[PDB]
Amino acid sequence: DLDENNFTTVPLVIDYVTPCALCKKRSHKHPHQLSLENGAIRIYKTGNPHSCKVKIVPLDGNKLFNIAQRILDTNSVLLTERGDHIVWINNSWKFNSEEPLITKL
């Protein structure tokens, strides 16, 4: 239901089968709320805020860090027990201590 312009406007209603990870309560009184401020999405409770805690989620950018995370999410680079990095290139798991292959990957 949330899109680019309603994300700070509509409360968020959840199914309280499990306790809230923030307030340790079985079922909350009111739906939670989202807010945007200086590049961080803040989620809190509505009604009596002191009933629950507040959570901050940061989003800043860093194209290069995002690229690194996306590359890491494909499980193409792995670290072994001995400490060498193995990469998945051209249908093979390759490692080479003297010639690094992360840049090739």
Next chain:
Amino acid sequence: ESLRDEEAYSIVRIFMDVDLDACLDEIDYLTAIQDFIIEVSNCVARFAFTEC
């Protein structure tokens, strides 16, 4: 409140005084107090570990 004796009952609790000449709303107050608690507890614990 004060201390009647500084030679035997020097034992006290950890306490702080904060006064900010401004008004904050509920959400900013809550995030600020969370961060304050974390920072101050870490600083005091590090001092205790490294000196006491």
